């Protein structure tokens, strides 16, 4: 049994394993204290304002406050609720019995006499937009310039989606319990989380591991990287065909091809309309760039047979970067994919012309790599409806029997059963050519023997990690430099 | 209200402050885990054998074991009791519910399959000698060569005295809760504790501070060191008379005098039988060494008037090092102290001839600095009965209105109300002349304005700290080198 939420995990740990809810709440609060100390150093000179709601997030806040008593310069709780859950009441009682001061009125000037704000207003129990007293207070904290530490989730972020519910706390440090929440991973939530620490508060480890949606980590990618046996030859490491480019878009094939080669693929062949095919070997003569005779500079049905022939002697086919999107391309792409009995990595213009019926009838696997504009056009929805919409991505992958790689600052990788989130990268990747590289990487890892899902997982991590290794300002990163950085990213991963 | 024991502190925290006993027990166990990680690094590759008794020490052990499940290579509990306290039963139940394995039979070969032993057999609840199964097991752990971590106190040490109750665990690391116990501080317990960490497990801080017996810390000594105002003159820093030496013991006065000067005293005068007085200025010409005309090389009543005259112009008098111990010395020492209306620091041969009636009738204060042989002769008991006997020291100080500084590897400093334990030093101080230096230091700090208790506290700490700063093997330390190291100890303390 997998478990979508910490709510189910908490309940089981209490009701079935028998851990008192108060023990979990104590472990949560002391983990916030320890995290603060790792981040601020010695706490003894700081004055803390702890903002508590009436739920168990506020209860966690009372634990924090009580544990700082007598050890820091000052502690004050502002209790912002109208009533208290039983564990919140218990820890409120402890805090007062230990000598702690609580007020129920928030005075704007109160921020002046404190150094650190502990945000324990709302956690996973947030429901609906924040207004009123709560909102004014959150807005005052965000204008204050103080150090902000959020308990579980910054108040105002929907922990299931990462959306802001009218307004939300911007934290320097967020301490979350058991596992990261989706709202720490997706934006805008990811941005408001600041530095995220995930604390073990005593849940059984197999329940924590029962979660079906994961952040892609360095350790996970290290274990998936294929082996390089010494006694090998190029065929050991697979062969990729890339069907890409047009008279309009001559550069895309080059970036995709080198993306396959830089991740260790043995042989890469491009099929590109003549004379644009010669661009590729002029820059990188280790590529094979086959000239395709076209009528007007674009792939059409007249090239169907030659592409299928070239596919026979490769392991994987990538298609789409720079193809263009007119009727002749659409007929070619769909007839080709319908007939191709090899794994396919489908990107860019091949997605824009794709008939999703074709995916349903394919026996061989596929990875699709849309950005949200492409995904939107693919399922006929708005960009705002598909962006960071992991449930829709899962549904699409399951219904069409593919892996879907929905690119954004956080990239979602899913086969419909398992969903992985990638958080490596930076804004240098928000630039033409970046996606073309990733397409090559994925096809390359598939050719080397990784499953479509594994190939996609490793590729999105390494593509973002390579961007982070760029030595100058990220806004100056281009795809050609990203390519150069891939082998360093691989070395560092090991 | 002061509180002799953690037992009273625990009870109050539960019954009056309202902290569930299970929350304290969870905080205790997780603190052991964190301490182990600080000491061993990453725990994940280690196999842990946790030895649990049937009391709350064993309960703490169950917390530890449960928190390691799924995170380390292996965990096994050997439960050694016949029944379980309620919190021990609760955490035993949790441990099993989480998948943990318990056995009730200890097999000698079991030590072979583990790397770390967690000793949770007996804590503060130890009563009487350890025998039987318990003893064989403790003896097997001490022969094993494994890493040993003791929960609260190594099993077998009496937490109130530091004595071994037949046999006891020798720990590499002891994690204790709230405050150090007397059995961590006094030997042999101090030796078996290994590295001691004191964990905050959630007691109110003012209860923790209500303890009346303290370890002397660097911070405490820093705050007591007297100020050196720039606009000062030697009189600002006090004047000491040292009455010391004999034809037999010519060196003692020198060590005592320089001990006063090295701690910052302004003027030091010695009174020493002629021609032994000339030894002092031959080595250290900054000393004043007044020649006392004696009949046979020892102080006697014929010197009473001259010593009282010399005392008029000083702040403090130290007496005893190297005086000798015959009848004429006894008459002189007792008549002098009876008449002297200045604070006195009484050491060595002055203690050996002391009539304790004289202390009772003195209006002025006194510090006495015996080693246990001297203390034994002073109260007419055996060395074994007075050694590390802090209750007897307290009773003596209170009954005689003095400060008693009972020297040993751990030195006990008490005025009968407050008792302080010093743990600085090493075996280089187990050598003639060491005590003479300390006597000078104490008189010097008194002359500079510290109370007898404060002077004694600062002096025992700095005397031991200076020994630790010796650059070569400690067994080669001599009193002359200890003197040279005092000003470095002072610098380092600031």
């Amino acid at each position: 049994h997998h478990h979508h939420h910490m709510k189910e995990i908490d309940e089981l740990t209490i009701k079935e394993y028998g851990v008192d809810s108060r023990i979990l709440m104590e472990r949560a609060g002391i983990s916030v204290v320890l995290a603060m100390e790792e981040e601020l150093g010695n706490l003894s000179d700081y004055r803390f304002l702890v903002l508590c709601g009436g739920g168990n997030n506020g209860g966690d806040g009372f634990v924090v406050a009580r544990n700082l008593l007598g050890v820091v310069k000052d502690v004050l709780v502002v209790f912002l609720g109208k009533k208290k859950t039983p564990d919140c009441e218990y820890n409120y009682g402890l805090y007062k019995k230990f000598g702690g001061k609580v007020v129920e009125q928030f005075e704007p000037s109160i921020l002046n006499e404190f150094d650190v704000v502990v945000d324990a207003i709302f956690g996973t129990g947030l429901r609906g937009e924040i207004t009123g007293e709560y909102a004014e207070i959150i807005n005052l904290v965000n204008k204050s310039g103080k150090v902000v530490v959020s308990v579980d989730v910054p108040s105002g972020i929907d922990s299931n989606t990462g959306k802001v519910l009218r307004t939300a706390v911007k934290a320097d440090l967020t301490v979350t319990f058991g596992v990261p929440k989706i709202g720490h991973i997706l934006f805008p939530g990811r941005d408001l989380t600041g530095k995220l620490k995930v604390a073990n508060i005593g849940h059984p480890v197999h329940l924590i591991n029962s979660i079906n949606r994961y952040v892609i980590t360095r350790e996970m990618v290290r274990s998936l990287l294929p082996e390089r046996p010494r006694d090998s030859h190029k065929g050991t490491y697979g062969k990729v065909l890339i069907i890409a480019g047009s008279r309009l878009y001559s550069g895309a094939p080059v970036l995709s091809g080198m993306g396959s080669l830089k991740v260790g693929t043995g042989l890469v062949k491009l099929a590109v309309p003549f004379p644009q095919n010669l661009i590729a070997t002029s820059r990188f003569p280790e590529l094979i760039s086959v000239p395709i005779d076209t009528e007007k500079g674009f792939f059409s049905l007249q090239n169907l047979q030659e592409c299928l022939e070239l596919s026979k002697d490769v392991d994987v086919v990538a298609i789409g970067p720079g193809l263009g999107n007119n009727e002749h391309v659409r007929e070619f792409v769909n007839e080709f994919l319908k007939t191709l009995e090899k794994p396919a990595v489908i990107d860019a213009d091949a997605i824009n012309v794709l008939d999703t019926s074709v995916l349903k009838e394919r026996k061989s696997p596929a990875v699709l790599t849309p950005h949200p504009g492409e995904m939107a056009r693919l399922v006929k929805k708005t960009v705002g409806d598909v962006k960071y919409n992991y449930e829709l991505a899962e549904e699409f992958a399951k219904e069409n029997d593919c892996v879907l790689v929905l690119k954004s600052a956080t990239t979602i990788v899913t086969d419909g059963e398992k969903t992985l989130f990638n958080i490596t990268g930076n804004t240098g990747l928000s630039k033409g050519g970046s996606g073309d590289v990733l397409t090559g990487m994925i096809a390359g890892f598939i050719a080397q023997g990784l499953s479509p899902l594994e190939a996609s997982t490793v590729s999105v991590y390494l593509h973002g990690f390579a961007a982070e290794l760029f030595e100058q300002d990220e806004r100056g990163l281009t795809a050609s430099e990203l390519l150069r950085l891939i082998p360093e990213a691989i070395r560092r991963l090991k | 209200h002061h509180h002799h024991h953690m037992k009273e502190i625990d009870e109050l925290t539960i019954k009056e402050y309202g902290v569930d006993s299970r929350i304290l027990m969870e905080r205790a166990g997780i603190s052991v885990v964190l301490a182990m990680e600080e000491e061993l690094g990453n725990l994940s590759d280690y196999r842990f054998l946790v030895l649990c008794g049937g009391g709350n020490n064993g309960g703490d052990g169950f917390v530890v074991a449960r928190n390691l499940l799924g995170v380390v290579k292996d965990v096994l509990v050997v439960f050694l009791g016949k029944k379980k306290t309620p919190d021990c039963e609760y955490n035993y139940g949790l441990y099993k519910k989480f998948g943990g394995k318990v056995v009730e039979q200890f097999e000698p070969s079991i030590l072979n399959e583990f790397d770390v032993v967690v000793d949770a057999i007996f804590g503060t609840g130890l009563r009487g000698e350890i025998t039987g199964e318990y003893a064989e097991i403790i003896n097997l752990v001490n022969k094993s060569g494994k890493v040993v971590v003791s929960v609260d106190v190594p099993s077998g040490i009496d937490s109130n005295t530091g004595k071994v109750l037949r046999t006891a665990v020798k720990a590499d690391l002891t994690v204790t809760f709230g405050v150090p116990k007397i059995g961590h501080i006094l030997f042999p317990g101090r030796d078996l504790t290994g590295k001691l960490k004191v964990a905050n497990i959630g007691h109110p801080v003012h209860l923790i501070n209500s303890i009346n017996r303290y370890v002397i810390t660097r911070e405490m000594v820093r705050s007591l060191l007297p100020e050196r105002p720039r606009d000062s003159h030697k009189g600002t820093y006090g004047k000491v008379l040292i009455i010391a030496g004999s034809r037999l013991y010519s060196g003692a006065p020198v060590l005592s005098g320089m001990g006063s000067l090295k701690v910052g005293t302004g003027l030091v005068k010695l009174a020493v039988p002629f021609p032994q007085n000339l030894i002092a200025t031959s080595r250290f010409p900054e000393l004043i060494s007044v020649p006392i005309d004696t009949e046979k090389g020892f102080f006697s009543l014929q010197n009473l008037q001259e010593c009282l005259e010399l005392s008029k112009d000083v702040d403090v008098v130290a007496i005893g090092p190297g005086l000798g111990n015959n009848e004429h010395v006894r008459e002189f020492v007792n008549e002098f102290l009876k008449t002297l209306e200045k604070p006195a620091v009484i050491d060595a041969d002055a203690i050996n001839v002391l009539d304790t009636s004289v202390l009772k009738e003195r209006k002025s204060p006194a510090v006495l600095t015996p080693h246990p042989g001297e203390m034994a002769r002073l109260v007419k008991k055996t060395v074994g009965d007075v050694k590390y006997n802090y209750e007897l020291a307290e009773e003596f100080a209170k009954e005689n209105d003095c400060v008693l500084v009972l020297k040993s590897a751990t030195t006990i400093v008490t005025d009968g109300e407050k008792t302080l334990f010093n743990i600085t030093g090493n075996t280089g101080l187990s050598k003639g002349g060491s005590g003479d230096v300390l006597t000078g230091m104490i008189a010097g700090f008194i002359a500079q304005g510290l109370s007898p208790l404060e002077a004694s506290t600062v002096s025992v700490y700095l005397h031991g700290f200076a020994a630790e700063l010796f650059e070569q093997d400690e067994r080669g330390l001599t009193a002359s080198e200890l003197l040279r190291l005092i000003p470095e100890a002072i610098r380092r303390l600031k």
Binding site: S31, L34, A35, E38, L196, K197, V198, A199, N200 | V33, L34, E37, E38, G41, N42, L43, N67, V71
Partner: peptide
């Protein structure tokens, strides 16, 4: 890196 309490 010891990670009993925290995953970064």
């Amino acid at each position: 890196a010891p990670a009993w309490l925290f995953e970064a």
